[PDB]
């Protein structure tokens, strides 16, 4: 089994996962009691996106070594990839009972609670991750998103600010920071961050529309009109862009433009 196993390892290292599977299987046909062998077979399937096979082999690894933190964590990952968030949570928790010093386990546990809608737990476990390794902009952004989702816009703002200190080249962090100020009703700060997002990524329709809304909420109707019109060059299909473009014209006393744009909105959705 040893040579088959090592041959499988050599294929694994060169990224050749189908060959690794063949020789791991050959080794296991000769010695089915190696946890590391079952674990490595589960990894090779995992890398090909065979999540159901990965699950079966990681469970075999765990029959032989129930205290493998690595086997529990990768079982949790395979469930996460199948969209089975509650199983992923159960297995991540088992991995952390055995090894509470992995940032990666706490972070992935946060991600699973997030995907289920438990922003509170997401917050708790993203914080743990960040304490063992505070260097990832993505992790700060996601803690930002969890507070945002709970409606803690000020904590959201705080952690988006942290993510942008580490990676100021992120349109999404800039955009969500604007969303967070928008949601507190700080429309001038919103406008500032929305403009940074669009200077970095200038062709999301939704984003030009949200810059429009922020000007509209400030009472800056002629700028609202300019950015709504930009949103509609990119997405001529949006009932909302047409309707708020109408509102902007109405607010300026431009009643015949208001009528034209309200009609456009009502054709795309005649239900309001
Ligand atoms: Cl919004
Ligand atoms: Zn191959
Ligand atoms: Zn043996
Ligand atoms: Zn499969
Ligand atoms: Zn062990
Ligand atoms: Zn161990
Ligand atoms: Zn499930
Ligand atoms: Zn909840
Ligand atoms: Zn819950
Ligand atoms: Zn909760
Ligand atoms: Zn906390
Ligand atoms: Zn708060
Ligand atoms: Zn603070
Ligand atoms: Zn007019």
**CA of 121 relative to ligand 6 center, distance in Å:** 27
Q: Which residue has the tokens 């992935």?
A: 108
Give the DSSP letter string of 141-180. HHHHHHHHHHT-HHHHHHHHHHHHHH-TT-HHHHHHHHHH
Q: Which residue has the tokens 């009932």?
A: 239
Tokens, residue 259: 């009528």
Sign for the pseudo-dihedral over CA of 169, 170, 173, 177: positive
Tokens, residue 98: 């055995």
What ligand is nearest to the CA atom of residue 253? Answer: 14
Residue 37: Cβ within 10 Å count = 24
**CA of 73 relative to ligand 7 center, distance in Å:** 16
What ligand is nearest to the CA atom of residue 62? Answer: 5
**CA of 31 relative to ligand 6 center, distance in Å:** 20
* Nearest partner of 34 among 10, 75, 70, 5, judged by Cα: 5
**CA of 39 relative to ligand 6 center, distance in Å:** 12
Range 37-43, long-range pairs (CB < 8 A, 24+ positions): 37/1, 37/5, 38/64, 39/68, 39/70, 39/71, 39/74, 40/5, 40/8, 40/9, 40/12, 42/71, 42/74, 42/78, 43/12, 43/74
DSSP state of 245: H
**CA of 158 relative to ligand 13 center, distance in Å:** 6
**CA of 123 relative to ligand 10 center, distance in Å:** 10
Sign for the pseudo-dihedral over CA of 204, 208, 146, 141: positive
Q: Is 33 helix (H, G, I), strand (E, B) or coil?
A: coil
Round to whole Å and give the CA distance between 166 and 140: 9
Q: Is 140 helix (H, G, I), strand (E, B) or coil?
A: helix
**CA of 108 relative to ligand 13 center, distance in Å:** 23
**CA of 144 relative to ligand 12 center, distance in Å:** 12
* Nearest partner of 117 among 138, 96, 89, judged by Cα: 89
**CA of 192 relative to ligand 4 center, distance in Å:** 48
**CA of 68 relative to ligand 6 center, distance in Å:** 5
| Resolution of the experimental structure, in angstroms | 2.0
**CA of 217 relative to ligand 5 center, distance in Å:** 59
**CA of 10 relative to ligand 2 center, distance in Å:** 12
**CA of 214 relative to ligand 1 center, distance in Å:** 9
143-163 in b/e burial notation, b at 16+ Cβ within 10 A? bbbbbbbeebbebbbebbebb
Q: Which residue has the tokens 């700080």?
A: 186
* Residues bordering ligand 11, an ion, CB closer than 5 Å: 127
Work out the angle at residue 227's Cα, subtended by the Cα atoms of residues 221 and 229, and round it to the nearest 5 degrees: 100
Q: Which residue has the tokens 């949006």?
A: 238
Sign for the pseudo-dihedral over CA of 253, 193, 198, 180: negative
Round to whole Å and give the CA distance between 204 and 238: 13
Residue 2: Cβ within 10 Å count = 10
Cα distances from 146 to residues 75, 105, 170, 172, in angstroms, run 24, 17, 18, 14
Dihedral Cα 23, 25, 29, 30, nearest 10 deg: 30
**CA of 33 relative to ligand 3 center, distance in Å:** 5
* Residues 6+ positions from 64 with CB-CB distance below 8 Å: 33, 34, 35, 38
């Amino acid at each position: 089994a040893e040579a088959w196993y090592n041959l499988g390892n050599a294929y694994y290292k060169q990224g050749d996962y189908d060959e690794a599977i063949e020789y791991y299987q050959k080794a296991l046909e000769l010695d089915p009691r190696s946890a590391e062998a079952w674990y490595n077979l589960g990894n090779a399937y995992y890398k090909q996106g065979d999540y159901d096979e990965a699950i079966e082999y990681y469970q075999k690894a765990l029959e032989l070594d129930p205290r493998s933190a690595e086997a529990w964590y990768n079982l949790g990952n395979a469930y996460y990839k199948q969209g089975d968030y509650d199983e992923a949570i159960e297995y991540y928790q088992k991995a952390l009972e055995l090894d509470p010093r992995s940032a990666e386990a706490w972070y992935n546990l946060g991600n699973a609670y997030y995907k289920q809608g438990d922003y509170d737990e997401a917050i708790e476990y993203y914080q743990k991750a960040l304490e063992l390794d505070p260097r990832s902009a993505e992790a700060w952004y996601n803690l930002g998103n969890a507070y945002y989702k709970q409606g803690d816009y000020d904590e959201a703002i705080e952690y988006y600010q942290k993510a942008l200190e580490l990676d100021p080249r992120s349109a999404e962090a800039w955009y969500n920071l604007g969303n967070a100020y928008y949601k507190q009703g700080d429309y001038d700060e919103a406008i500032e961050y929305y403009q940074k997002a669009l200077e970095l990524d200038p062709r999301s329709a939704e984003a030009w529309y949200n810059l429009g809304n922020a000007y509209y909420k400030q009472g800056d109707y002629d700028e609202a009109i300019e950015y709504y019109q930009k949103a509609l060059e990119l997405d001529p299909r949006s009932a909302e862009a047409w309707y708020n473009l109408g509102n902007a014209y109405y607010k300026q006393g431009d009643y015949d433009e208001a009528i034209e744009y309200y009609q456009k909105a009502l054709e795309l959705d005649p239900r309001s």
